[PDB]
């Protein structure tokens, strides 16, 4: 089945471009990285980063996660990001996101060998 690590790069990295600039961007990315098959997810971020310097995050701020595992850890510097979430009329199938960038720090649970991102947290 697909990994924690392999899900986490599915659902937020998009290393491609340095910003999602166009406004069309999350209902695209959304649908293309398989977040709108059977439902709608609400919200998702996606991270414009190299995986190298998100990876490096594991090597950062440690912080508690949500859930209240000690095994977060925060950007020291900001990354662009792009935040997606269904907007209040959007009706599956026809999954509809407003578009936000933006340069933040991420927060995201490291796990495993090589020891790497396996859940997205927080910006902040």
Partial sequence: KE???AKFE???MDSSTSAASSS???NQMMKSRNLTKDRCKPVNTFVHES???VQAVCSQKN???KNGQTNCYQSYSTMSITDCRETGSSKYPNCAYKTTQAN???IVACEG???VPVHFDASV
């Fill in 3 to 5: 990994t924690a690590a």
């Fill in 10 to 12: 599915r659902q937020h």
């Fill in 24 to 26: 069309n961007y999350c």
């Fill in 51 to 53: 995986l190298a310097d």
């Fill in 63 to 65: 912080v508690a996660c």
């Fill in 104 to 106: 933040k720090h991420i």
């Fill in 113 to 115: 060998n090589p020891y």
